[PDB]
């Protein structure tokens, strides 16, 4: 085994376990009695002051274990095919399971101890800690990485065209081939695994589209003076000169007021202004990805995806899923899932996320609604009246798709 | 008898050493009596005469005959740290009824459980002479007192009591601290036989267990309660009776007294609270006010009070209903059968800067949720006094991500309702306020005013302002001499945050007021537009 370490003056993960639902805690007791057996975790004592926490997910129920914080601590290790992007069609696989045969460093294990809470507090949790590579650890397909290759080596070279990513746990799977044939390249691949939906060009950016009146309102002139205003934080050019001379006096909210020609060219530049996204933005690794979450309501949600403020990498606009209306910690973290994978796919990183969300409440329902083998990072913010407001303008197909 | 379990492996904290603390000189009388009781732990294999290689020490004490006593906060200093010793208490609504339960009282467990044999070397310690070299020791089994005592005692008996559970799953034990509960729904014969197959366990583990002496029988005191077979209830509550109370017994008092809201129904603290302002001093003697004493005199009636809860009843229902008490107060009651309840409680009245009785509602619901998982590993039906139309309304249009788990309505008056909801779009044929404030934020003296499209205006001077005031009050005077239906025109940003969280209660007097003139409104619109 590779001798892995903290990164220096790290100290190993002391995050508490959330408690959790029996049916969630029952689960885990199983996984772990069975992972315990197969010796690829062992109990440990109190001497172990680590934890990490645990918890379970989705038909049967899968272990997920939130190492963000040891993954942090973790030592860097020794690329991102930005063709991936390109592909019409691209899918993901858990390659977890992969990592249950390389051992772990013995000295290194005791810091991936995590905890099974007790109901109650009636006793105390059940700890262990890892043998093997875990799921859901930087290390671990860092570790396997050698090993990726030679399985894959083959696959690769015989279709040079599919291009293949590997982040975390999933296997991002790449090509342009037909539905089918494409299915059937998976499984070609599948099965050459199993022995041992996504679509990044259909993803076009939407530009803000200033609203259209037959006659505009005082009110009208206000909020969409309110809105460029703003707005001009990204684009210079933009300006509400003219429309803000519309507005002087003191008019019922309710006044029609006749536009004069430069107040019909001002907001005329401003549109072309707005056609296409402001120039200059380029990613820098060096940086973190920013994604901003908005909610819009009536199950919509827009998002930003950014370094530097207002120099968006990436824009856009989620809708509620089938049968997930009364729920809007739901919507969201499927609204992260997806905002999150599309930014593996494009820069091969996740985000860190400002969610408009309550800490407690995210805290105590993301679990019941996560999916994926990973968890980025998030802080809960106030968005701001305007910002939603302004993105709330993005553009919508014609009829639909 | 020591146990025959293996050690768990202690080391110092990162590159410190162990202690080396100066032995506080004794009496003869003192060091008389450590000498025996030390003589007896060294018989019983618990403590090693050692000699003077040893260069640690920790300083032993004689209390009241007499009892030892090591201090060993300089030990515990220099000690690693474990696991978190189980920091969640349980609650009695949370345990499931059984037909039996049993205490083990495991205590003298500590001097039970060898110690790290490398670690032994630290907790040296020194007793007196009348002068001449004082007799040297270091423990063999965990030092009462020590750091890592508690987590191994109890990552031990884990161990131990693993086996008789896996042959057993019919019986249930907890553990906590230097105790077993052990229950079963087996006929009380059987259950008593293994309890004492039990005993006969940890016994055959060097663990003793009580005697007919030290048994305890229900009912049973827990942080509080009392555990009776098929029902808990609560110690009963003192409250002092007085002719002369200090600021620390009023303190005190209240203290108790707020714990007890959450049993109990009605307790109230205010007037004893206001007691308290401008104290000098702890022992400063307060005189009760006519209200205090009533208020005082009534909580002992609401105290006299058989308040009783139930077990629980893993295959029934789960339900939680809530009320709301008064503005920011919140009461609740977990059961399963109707008015048999597991537990109830009241959440005190959150001072948000700016928040609502729909927002509030939902964070109540989430503590008792997040409180539920804890204490059953589930989460609850709802009975929530809103009705459903009001949290669709409210939620599908709140800038702000919120959820309340499957619940029902339940027509408990008062009722959670929207205090007021700002128009969708500019009212036709209401007045146009367009309002404004400024201030010159050092001096503080600003001006508040509007001006209608109906030609109606106004501006009032103000001393002692600042900016955020003046365009508050701008819009408090609109609201004030407004009709029914106003639009109201703004460039404050603050504003902005009223139109998209629509607070009833905040922080502000200013704001509280204006809330007061938007709920009475029948249609309010308010607009935002960029300063200057
Ligand atoms: C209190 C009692 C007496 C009898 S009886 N008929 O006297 O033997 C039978 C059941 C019960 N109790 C129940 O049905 C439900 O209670 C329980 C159900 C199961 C178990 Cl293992 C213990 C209890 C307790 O009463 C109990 C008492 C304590 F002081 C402390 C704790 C603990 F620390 F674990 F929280 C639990």
Same mark, same amino acid.
Request: proline share 7%; glycine share 6%; with cysteine.
């Given at each position: 085994?590779?001798?892995?370490?903290?990164?220096?003056?790290?100290?190993?993960?002391?995050?508490?376990?959330?408690?959790?639902?029996?049916?969630?805690?029952?689960?885990?007791?199983?996984?772990?009695?069975?992972?315990?057996?197969?010796?690829?975790?062992?109990?440990?004592?109190?001497?172990?002051?680590?934890?990490?926490?645990?918890?379970?997910?989705?038909?049967?129920?899968?272990?997920?274990?939130?190492?963000?914080?040891?993954?942090?601590?973790?030592?860097?290790?020794?690329?991102?095919?930005?063709?991936?992007?390109?592909?019409?069609?691209?899918?993901?696989?858990?390659?977890?399971?992969?990592?249950?045969?390389?051992?772990?460093?013995?000295?290194?294990?005791?810091?991936?101890?995590?905890?099974?809470?007790?109901?109650?507090?009636?006793?105390?949790?059940?700890?262990?800690?890892?043998?093997?590579?875990?799921?859901?650890?930087?290390?671990?397909?860092?570790?396997?990485?050698?090993?990726?290759?030679?399985?894959?080596?083959?696959?690769?070279?015989?279709? @040079?065209?599919?291009?293949?990513?590997?982040?975390?746990?999933?296997?991002?799977?790449?090509?342009?081939?037909?539905?089918?044939?494409?299915?059937?390249?998976?499984?070609?691949?599948?099965?050459?695994?199993?022995?041992?939906?996504?679509?990044?060009?259909?993803?076009?950016?939407?530009?803000?589209?200033?609203?259209?009146?037959?006659?505009?309102?005082?009110?009208?002139?206000?909020?969409?003076?309110?809105?460029?205003?703003?707005?001009?934080?990204?684009?210079?050019?933009?300006?509400?000169?003219?429309?803000?001379?519309?507005?002087?006096?003191?008019?019922?909210?309710?006044?029609?007021?006749?536009?004069?020609?430069?107040?019909?060219?001002?907001?005329?530049?401003?549109?072309?202004?707005?056609?296409?996204?402001?120039?200059?933005?380029?990613?820098?690794?060096?940086?973190?990805?920013?994604?901003?979450?908005?909610?819009?309501?009536?199950?919509?949600?827009?998002?930003?995806?950014?370094?530097?403020?207002?120099?968006?990498?990436?824009?856009?606009?989620?809708?509620?899923?089938?049968?997930?209306?009364?729920?809007?910690?739901?919507?969201?973290?499927?609204?992260?899932?997806?905002?999150?994978?599309?930014?593996?796919?494009?820069?091969?990183?996740? +985000?860190?996320?400002?969610?408009?969300?309550?800490?407690?409440?995210?805290?105590?329902?993301?679990?019941?609604?996560?999916?994926?083998?990973?968890?980025?990072?998030?802080?809960?913010?106030?968005?701001?009246?305007?910002?939603?407001?302004?993105?709330?303008?993005?553009?919508?197909?014609?009829?639909?798709? | 008898?020591?146990?025959?379990?293996?050690?768990?492996?202690?080391?110092?904290?990162?590159?410190?050493?162990?202690?080396?603390?100066?032995?506080?000189?004794?009496?003869?009388?003192?060091?008389?009596?450590?000498?025996?009781?030390?003589?007896?732990?060294?018989?019983?294999?618990?403590?090693?005469?050692?000699?003077?290689?040893?260069?640690?020490?920790?300083?032993?004490?004689?209390?009241?005959?007499?009892?030892?006593?090591?201090?060993?906060?300089?030990?515990?200093?220099?000690?690693?740290?474990?696991?978190?010793?189980?920091?969640?208490?349980?609650?009695?609504?949370?345990?499931?009824?059984?037909?039996?339960?049993?205490?083990?009282?495991?205590?003298?467990?500590?001097?039970?459980?060898?110690?790290?044999?490398?670690?032994?070397?630290?907790?040296?310690?020194?007793?007196?002479?009348?002068?001449?070299?004082?007799? %040297?020791?270091?423990?063999?089994?965990? +030092?009462?007192?020590?750091?890592?005592?508690?987590?191994?005692?109890?990552?031990?008996?884990?161990?131990?009591?693993? +086996?008789?559970?896996?042959?057993?799953?019919?019986?249930?034990?907890?553990?906590?601290?230097?105790?077993?509960?052990?229950?079963?729904?087996?006929?009380?014969?059987?259950? %008593?036989?293994?309890?004492?197959?039990?005993?006969?366990?940890?016994?055959?583990?060097?663990?003793?267990? @009580?005697?007919?002496?030290?048994?305890?029988?229900?009912?049973?005191?827990?942080?509080?309660?009392?555990?009776?077979?098929?029902?808990?209830?609560?110690?009963?509550?003192?409250?002092?009776?007085?002719?002369?109370?200090?600021?620390?017994?009023?303190?005190?008092?209240?203290?108790?007294?707020?714990?007890?809201?959450?049993?109990?129904?009605?307790?109230?603290?205010?007037?004893?609270?206001?007691?308290?302002?401008?104290?000098?001093?702890?022992?400063?003697?307060? @005189?009760?006010?006519?209200?205090?004493?009533?208020?005082?005199?009534?909580?002992?009636?609401?105290?006299?009070?058989?308040?009783?809860?139930?077990?629980?009843?893993?295959?029934?229902?789960?339900?939680?209903?809530?009320?709301?008490?008064?503005?920011?107060?919140?009461?609740?009651?977990?059961?399963?059968?109707?008015?048999?309840?597991?537990?109830?409680?009241?959440?005190?009245?959150?001072?948000?800067?700016?928040?609502?009785?729909?927002?509030?509602?939902?964070?109540?619901?989430?503590?008792?949720?997040?409180?539920?998982?804890?204490?059953?590993?589930?989460?609850?039906?709802?009975?929530?006094?809103?009705?459903?139309?009001?949290?669709?309304?409210?939620?599908?249009?709140?800038?702000?991500?919120?959820?309340?788990?499957?619940?029902?309505?339940?027509?408990?008056?008062?009722?959670?309702?929207?205090?007021?909801?700002?128009?969708?779009?500019?009212?036709?044929?209401?007045?146009?306020?367009?309002?404004?404030?400024?201030?010159?934020?050092?001096?503080?003296?600003?001006?508040?005013?509007?001006?209608?499209?109906?030609?109606?205006?106004?501006?009032?001077?103000?001393?002692?302002?600042?900016?955020?005031?003046?365009?508050?009050?701008?819009?408090?005077?609109?609201?004030?001499?407004?009709?029914?239906?106003?639009?109201?025109?703004?460039?404050?940003?603050?504003?902005?945050?009223?139109?998209?969280?629509?607070?009833?209660?905040?922080?502000?007097?200013?704001?509280?007021?204006?809330?007061?003139?938007?709920?009475?409104?029948?249609?309010?619109?308010?607009?935002?537009? @960029?300063?200057?």
């Amino acid at each position: 085994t590779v001798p892995v370490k903290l990164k220096p003056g790290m100290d190993g993960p002391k995050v508490k376990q959330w408690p959790l639902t029996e049916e969630k805690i029952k689960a885990l007791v199983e996984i772990c009695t069975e992972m315990e057996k197969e010796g690829k975790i062992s109990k440990i004592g109190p001497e172990n002051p680590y934890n990490t926490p645990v918890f379970a997910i989705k038909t049967k129920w899968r272990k997920l274990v939130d190492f963000r914080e040891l993954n942090k601590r973790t030592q860097d290790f020794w690329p991102h095919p930005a063709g991936l992007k390109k592909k019409k069609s691209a899918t993901v696989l858990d390659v977890g399971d992969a990592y249950f045969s390389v051992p772990l460093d013995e000295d290194f294990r005791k810091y991936t101890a995590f905890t099974i809470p007790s109901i109650n507090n009636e006793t105390p949790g059940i700890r262990y800690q890892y043998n093997v590579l875990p799921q859901g650890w930087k290390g671990s397909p860092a570790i396997f990485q050698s090993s990726m290759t030679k399985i894959l080596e083959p696959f690769r070279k015989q279709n @040079p065209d599919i291009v293949i990513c590997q982040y975390m746990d999933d296997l991002y799977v790449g090509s342009d081939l037909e539905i089918g044939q494409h299915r059937t390249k998976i499984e070609e691949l599948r099965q050459h695994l199993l022995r041992w939906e996504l679509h990044p060009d259909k993803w076009t950016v939407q530009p803000i589209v200033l609203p259209e009146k037959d006659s505009w309102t005082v009110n009208d002139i206000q909020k969409l003076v309110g809105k460029l205003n703003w707005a001009s934080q990204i684009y210079p050019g933009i300006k509400v000169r003219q429309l803000c001379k519309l507005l002087r006096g003191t008019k019922a909210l309710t006044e029609v007021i006749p536009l004069t020609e430069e107040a019909e060219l001002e907001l005329a530049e401003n549109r072309e202004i707005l056609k296409e996204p402001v120039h200059g933005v380029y990613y820098d690794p060096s940086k973190d990805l920013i994604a901003e979450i908005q909610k819009q309501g009536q199950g919509q949600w827009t998002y930003q995806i950014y370094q530097e403020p207002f120099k968006n990498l990436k824009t856009g606009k989620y809708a509620r899923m089938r049968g997930a209306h009364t729920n809007d910690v739901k919507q969201l973290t499927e609204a992260v899932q997806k905002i999150t994978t599309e930014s593996i796919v494009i820069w091969g990183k996740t +985000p860190k996320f400002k969610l408009p969300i309550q800490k407690e409440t995210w805290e105590t329902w993301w679990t019941e609604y996560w999916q994926a083998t990973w968890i980025p990072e998030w802080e809960f913010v106030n968005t701001p009246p305007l910002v939603k407001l302004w993105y709330q303008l993005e553009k919508e197909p014609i009829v639909g798709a | 008898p020591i146990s025959p379990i293996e050690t768990v492996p202690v080391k110092l904290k990162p590159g410190m050493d162990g202690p080396k603390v100066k032995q506080w000189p004794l009496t003869e009388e003192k060091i008389k009596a450590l000498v025996e009781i030390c003589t007896e732990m060294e018989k019983e294999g618990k403590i090693s005469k050692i000699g003077p290689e040893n260069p640690y020490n920790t300083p032993v004490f004689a209390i009241k005959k007499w009892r030892k006593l090591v201090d060993f906060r300089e030990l515990n200093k220099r000690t690693q740290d474990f696991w978190e010793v189980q920091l969640g208490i349980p609650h009695p609504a949370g345990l499931k009824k059984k037909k039996s339960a049993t205490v083990l009282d495991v205590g003298d467990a500590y001097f039970s459980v060898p110690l790290d044999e490398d670690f032994r070397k630290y907790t040296a310690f020194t007793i007196p002479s009348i002068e001449t070299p004082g007799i %040297r020791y270091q423990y063999n089994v965990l +030092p009462q007192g020590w750091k890592g005592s508690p987590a191994i005692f109890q990552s031990s008996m884990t161990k131990i009591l693993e +086996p008789f559970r896996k042959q057993n799953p019919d019986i249930v034990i907890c553990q906590y601290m230097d105790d077993l509960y052990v229950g079963s729904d087996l006929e009380i014969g059987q259950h %008593r036989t293994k309890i004492e197959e039990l005993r006969q366990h940890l016994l055959r583990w060097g663990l003793t267990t @009580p005697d007919k002496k030290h048994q305890k029988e229900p009912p049973f005191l827990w942080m509080g309660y009392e555990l009776h077979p098929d029902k808990w209830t609560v110690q009963p509550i003192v409250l002092p009776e007085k002719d002369s109370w200090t600021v620390n017994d009023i303190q005190k008092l209240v203290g108790k007294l707020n714990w007890a809201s959450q049993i109990y129904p009605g307790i109230k603290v205010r007037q004893l609270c206001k007691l308290l302002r401008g104290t000098k001093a702890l022992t400063e003697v307060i @005189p009760l006010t006519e209200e205090a004493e009533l208020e005082l005199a009534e909580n002992r009636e609401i105290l006299k009070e058989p308040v009783h809860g139930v077990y629980y009843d893993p295959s029934k229902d789960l339900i939680a209903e809530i009320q709301k008490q008064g503005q920011g107060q919140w009461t609740y009651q977990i059961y399963q059968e109707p008015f048999k309840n597991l537990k109830t409680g009241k959440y005190a009245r959150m001072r948000g800067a700016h928040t609502n009785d729909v927002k509030q509602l939902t964070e109540a619901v989430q503590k008792i949720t997040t409180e539920s998982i804890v204490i059953w590993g589930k989460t609850p039906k709802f009975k929530l006094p809103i009705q459903k139309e009001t949290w669709e309304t409210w939620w599908t249009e709140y800038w702000q991500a919120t959820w309340i788990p499957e619940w029902e309505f339940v027509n408990t008056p008062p009722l959670v309702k929207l205090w007021y909801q700002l128009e969708k779009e500019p009212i036709v044929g209401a007045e146009t306020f367009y309002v404004d404030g400024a201030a010159n934020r050092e001096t503080k003296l600003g001006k508040a005013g509007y001006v209608t499209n109906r030609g109606r205006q106004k501006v009032v001077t103000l001393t002692d302002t600042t900016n955020q005031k003046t365009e508050l009050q701008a819009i408090y005077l609109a609201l004030q001499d407004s009709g029914l239906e106003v639009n109201i025109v703004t460039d404050s940003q603050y504003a902005l945050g009223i139109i998209q969280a629509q607070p009833d209660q905040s922080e502000s007097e200013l704001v509280n007021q204006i809330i007061e003139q938007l709920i009475k409104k029948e249609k309010v619109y308010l607009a935002w537009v @960029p300063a200057h």
